[PDB]
């Protein structure tokens, strides 16, 4: 959005997709990220000239970057500026460019970054790290680095925001008579008491066993949801107990 062709301009942004485990995301964590950015030659100090040589005033534009283009009218003179045949900038140290960056002041560096992942992130949350990402032009600023969280599934839990979700399979006997089960939690295990008579679908709410909130909130909750499993692959002693169960209870 500026007419000066050699105006300063910010470098390209970068994106890193970082893979987390279910729990890494629930809690905090930290990673070092290794990658190759374009950074700006340390070998030439940013000007693409063999050290001990120098950019020099242009052998056409005479230090202007532009060629005045003057045309005689009846009433006067027309001046058109067109950007220089050669330098397109200011100087012209092209006879001796830096060896590594082939003249443009930008070296492929190897870079590493220390990232605090705050507790509670979900897949697709981004973090902006200001300095990182690619080199600016004509002395402009450095790009930003953007990491997107990508969270791996759990074998036990589903999640959504602060809330954790666990399904409990109960058998008929446990459902009818009640029972006490150990319930997995991202914070460790928790004993839960199942009343006698539990209907399938029942939702139990464990307070503050869910995920920490990004926006300063208190920890969320883990909701346990009961599923009653019909039994299958039943031997004859088992089918007798049930037929005998049926009879006891229509008497």
Binding residues: 41, 44, 58, 61, 84, 87, 98, 101
52-81 positions binding Zn ion, by CB under 5 A:
58, 60-61
Number of residues that bind Zn ion (CB under 5 A): 12
| 128, 144 contact by CB (below 8 A) | yes
Interacting span for Zn ion (CB under 5 A) from 6-14, 36-44, 137-145, 202-210: 36-44
Instruction: Pick one of 14, 25, 39, 101: the residue that binds Zn ion (CB under 5 A).
Output: 101
Shortest separation between residue 44's beta carbon and Zn ion, angstroms: 3
Smaller CB distance to Zn ion: residue 26 or 84? 84
Distance CA 91, CA 105 (A): 14
- Using rule CB under 5 A, residue 41 touches Zn ion: yes
Distance CA 141, CA 39 (A): 11
In 75-102, which positions are buried (b, 16+ CB within 10 angstroms) versus exposed (e)? eeeeeeeeebeebeebbbbeebbbeebe
Output the known binding site for Zn(2+): 41, 44, 58, 61, 84, 87, 98, 101
Smaller CB distance to Zn ion: residue 86 or 242? 86
Smaller CB distance to Zn ion: residue 44 or 135? 44
User: 27: Cβ–Cβ under 8 A, 6 or more apart, which residues?
Assistant: 119, 212
Closest CA to 13 of 114, 115, 131, 117: 131
- Using rule CB under 5 A, residue 98 touches Zn ion: yes
Shortest separation between residue 63's beta carbon and Zn ion, angstroms: 8
Shortest separation between residue 5's beta carbon and Zn ion, angstroms: 11
Closest CA to 120 of 222, 215, 224: 215
Distance CA 174, CA 180 (A): 9
Expressed in percent and rounded to 5, the helix, strand and coil fractions of the chain are 10, 35, 55
Instruction: Pick one of 26, 84, 145, 147: the residue that binds Zn ion (CB under 5 A).
Output: 84
Instruction: Pick one of 7, 69, 86, 218: the residue that binds Zn ion (CB under 5 A).
Output: 86
The binding site for Zn ion (CB under 5 A) comprises: 41, 43-44, 48, 58, 60-61, 84, 86-87, 98, 101
């Amino acid at each position: 959005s500026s007419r000066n062709p050699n105006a300063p301009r910010q470098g390209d942004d970068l994106q890193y997709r970082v893979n987390l485990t279910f729990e890494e995301a629930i809690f905090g964590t930290e990673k070092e990220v290794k990658y190759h950015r374009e950074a700006g030659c340390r070998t030439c100090n940013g000007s693409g000239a063999k050290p001990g040589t120098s950019p020099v005033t242009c052998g056409r534009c005479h230090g202007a970057g532009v060629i005045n283009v003057d045309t005689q009218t009846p009433l006067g003179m027309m001046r058109r500026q067109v950007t220089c045949d050669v330098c397109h900038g200011r100087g012209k140290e092209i006879k001796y460019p830096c060896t590594t960056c082939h003249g443009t002041g930008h070296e492929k560096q190897a870079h590493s970054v220390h990232v605090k992942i705050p507790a509670g992130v979900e897949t697709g949350q981004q973090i902006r790290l200001a300095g990182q990402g690619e080199a600016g032009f004509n002395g402009g600023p450095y790009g930003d680095l953007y990491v997107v969280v990508s969270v791996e599934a759990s074998d036990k839990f589903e999640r959504e925001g602060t809330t954790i979700f666990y399904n409990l399979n109960l058998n008929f006997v446990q459902a009818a008579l009640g029972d006490t089960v150990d319930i997995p939690t991202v914070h460790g295990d928790v004993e839960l008491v199942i009343p006698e008579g539990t209907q399938t679908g029942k939702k139990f709410r464990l307070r503050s066993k869910g995920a920490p909130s990004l926006r300063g909130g208190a920890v969320g909750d883990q909701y346990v949801t009961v599923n009653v499993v019909t039994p299958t692959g039943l031997n004859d002693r088992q089918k007798v107990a049930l037929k005998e169960f049926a009879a006891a209870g229509d008497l």
